[PDB]
């Protein structure tokens, strides 16, 4: 029944959106070029500050549009009719027994009614050593209609009829198949779902589900018929596993809350979390065949939903606890994969910007064009010849992060967001080279970091050389040296306070 949707006047809105994007890009290019003519190395604080206020205004706009959406969703009330079925589809590939059993218990203890909740688990097994997942699934429920199948091959080379009847007729289904990656199991589950249900939730084998999460997703999805997909707030089950774990948790909270609420205010959520997401079965079936043959991401499914003409939402009342990598360069590989998926799709959504609000185009344009401008500004400032320039660049970056953390603290109401300032160091060393390598691609991850470190150290050395070339005995350098020393001691004290409060909040 559902089909692709277009606005009332596709040509007018398309032209308006492309004109707006082109004008925004040209305006940004004008100011940076205007900045080079208007000011040189003479006024770095003016050169940087203007940009800092730009980011700050963007952050305030996002925060306002997120707070408005949060207040609207909190004030609005709608009792659940409990007349819509929900099918929870879970993927398995050699999962740890404890995490899997926790996920199964969480899925079996949802507040949703038993008669309206189907459960399907698809495993990349087909071997004897994967039978423990099926055994655990059988022992966990043991009470409802349990149907387990082993199979001898995936859907793309009879077991197909058995799988379909077991999924569509029983409540708890456990289907194993030949290993084909996380896309094969999701495709098999979606194909076997058919028309049995109308709402399908996607989950992985390592998440813990809250009791009211499914109820809240059903409530928000039943409010309007134009919604096609919805997500929830995903927390971290191990915030103190490592240093990167707490930073990942803080970044997850900030990203989810601010960005997803701001996008839900315009119904243009770009990405829906894989562990916590719900989709319409009628819409999902239409794009299912197309999605499998694309040359199984959560950003790709959301992009397909957006391209189908329907809008996606996000509610903070639905909560779940996922996990994040704790060993180094693994978070880096995950970030590189995320950047590739983001870029291969920044390319997808560049086609149907007119189908949603102009906020989608604005955010895409700024996210595509800012990192390059930041990199160019950093390179220009470091490759100047004065320690003043690089020192004040670092100071201004840390100041920007400090106001960002303060704003996050004010928004959340908790003072733990002040610790997010280390994200600046995290991004300035690992995230930019990873993004560049991901762009160029379309151990391995250690090369971009080494290249970035080498170029940064070369720039610092060149600046130091050019600074010591001039004699400092002249009376025009004493004030510069005093200012540099005061700035350096302030930076050292700020970093010491940051680390001290980090250790106090972590150890206790």
């Amino acid at each position, epitope marked *: 029944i559902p089909k692709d949707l277009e606005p009332k006047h596709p040509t007018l809105w398309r032209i308006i959106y492309y004109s707006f994007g082109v004008v925004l890009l040209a305006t940004i290019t004008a100011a940076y070029v205007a900045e080079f003519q208007v000011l040189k190395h003479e006024a770095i604080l003016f050169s940087l500050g203007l940009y800092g206020l730009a980011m700050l205004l963007h952050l305030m706009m996002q925060s306002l549009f997120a707070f408005l959406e949060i207040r609207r969703v909190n004030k609005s009330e709608l009792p659940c009719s409990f007349k819509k*079925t929900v099918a929870l589809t879970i993927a398995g590939y050699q999962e740890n027994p404890e995490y899997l059993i926790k996920c199964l218990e969480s899925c079996k203890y949802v507040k949703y*009614p*038993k*008669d309206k909740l*189907k459960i399907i688990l698809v495993i990349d097994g087909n071997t004897e050593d994967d039978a423990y997942m099926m055994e655990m699934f059988k022992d966990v429920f043991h*009470g*409802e*209609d349990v149907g387990t199948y082993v199979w001898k091959g995936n859907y793309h080379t009879e077991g197909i009829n058995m799988v379909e*009847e077991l999924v*569509r*007729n*029983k*409540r708890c289904v456990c289907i194993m198949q030949q290993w084909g990656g996380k896309r094969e199991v999701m495709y098999t589950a979606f194909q076997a779902i*058919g*028309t*049995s*249900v109308d709402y399908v939730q996607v989950c992985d084998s390592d998440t813990k589900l809250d009791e009211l999460a499914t109820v809240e997703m059903v409530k928000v999805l039943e409010s309007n018929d134009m919604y096609g997909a919805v997500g929830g707030d995903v927390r971290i089950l191990n915030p103190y596993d490592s240093f990167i774990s707490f930073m990942s948790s803080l970044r997850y909270w900030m990203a989810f809350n601010v960005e997803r609420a701001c996008q839900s205010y315009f119904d243009c959520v770009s990405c829906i979390s894989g562990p916590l997401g719900m989709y319409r079965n009628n819409i999902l079936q239409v794009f299912l065949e197309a999605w499998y043959r694309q040359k199984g991401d959560d950003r790709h499914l959301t992009n397909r939903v957006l391209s189908m003409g329907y809008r996606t939402k996000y509610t903070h009342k639905s909560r779940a606890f996922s996990e994040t990598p704790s060993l180094y360069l693994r978070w880096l590989n995950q970030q590189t994969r995320w950047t590739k998926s983001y870029f291969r799709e920044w390319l997808y959504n560049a086609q149907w910007w007119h189908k949603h609000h102009i906020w989608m185009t604005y955010e895409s344009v700024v996210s595509f064009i800012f990192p390059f401008f930041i990199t160019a500004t950093v390179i220009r400032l470091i490759y100047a010849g004065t320690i003043w320039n690089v020192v004040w660049l670092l100071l201004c970056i840390q100041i920007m992060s400090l106001f960002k953390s303060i704003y996050a603290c004010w928004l959340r109401g908790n003072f733990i967001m002040l610790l997010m300032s280390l994200y600046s160091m995290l991004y300035m060393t690992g995230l930019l080279p990873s993004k560049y390598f991901a762009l160029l691609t379309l151990y391995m991850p250690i090369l971009p970091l080494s290249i970035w470190a080498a170029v940064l150290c070369g720039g610092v050395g060149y600046s130091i050389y050019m600074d010591c070339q001039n004699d400092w005995s002249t009376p025009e350098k004493q004030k510069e040296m005093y200012h540099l020393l005061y700035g350096c001691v302030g930076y050292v004290m700020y970093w010491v306070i940051m680390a001290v409060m980090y250790w106090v909040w972590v150890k206790r």
Partner: antibody
Amino acid sequence: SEVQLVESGGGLVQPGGSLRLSCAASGFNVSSYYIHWVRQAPGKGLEWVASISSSSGSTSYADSVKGRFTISADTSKNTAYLQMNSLRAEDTAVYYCARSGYYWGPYFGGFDYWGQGTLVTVSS
Amino acid sequence: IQMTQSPSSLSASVGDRVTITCRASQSVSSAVAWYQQKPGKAPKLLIYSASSLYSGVPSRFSGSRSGTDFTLTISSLQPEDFATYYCQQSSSSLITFGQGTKVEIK
């Protein structure tokens, strides 16, 4: 394997009286399965009376059954009860308690594991 | 809201393919099941969800649908096949049963 349903409470009652049939299940829990009551009049086909899904509160009754019959389930005793009051002449039949799965979409699963009925005689 | 089992009677010899057809007024979101009942015993389920076959049933009962009509076919009339066949449309808050369709012998 061992799933069974045994119902009792049938008997001879005066017209306009009350009755309480009870079907107890063995080998499974009634909380994860639907329970339905089917009545077969002598010399006629099966007729549906009521259906209940415990742990959810979803109860349904027929058009000619509504207003006089009540259906309930008790998980502690694992027994489904059907109470009838103000019975009429056209109520003497054999009542079956049968289990089934969930409805979902267009796939149900049918009425599996039926039980041998009991005779009800509403006459004077 | 009502159903009609068209044959309502049948009399065929052994090894003869028989077909029982059932017409339902509405089949939007409801499943059709075919049961078999012998005199003095409770009905036994044969084919679920229109075409799916129940476990233990011999591979001679075929269920099919053609829109508003549902057909149950027996390729060969085995000696343990003469009973009453019932067609039921199962749905929430409304369950209807068929009538008649007794297969005799000749």
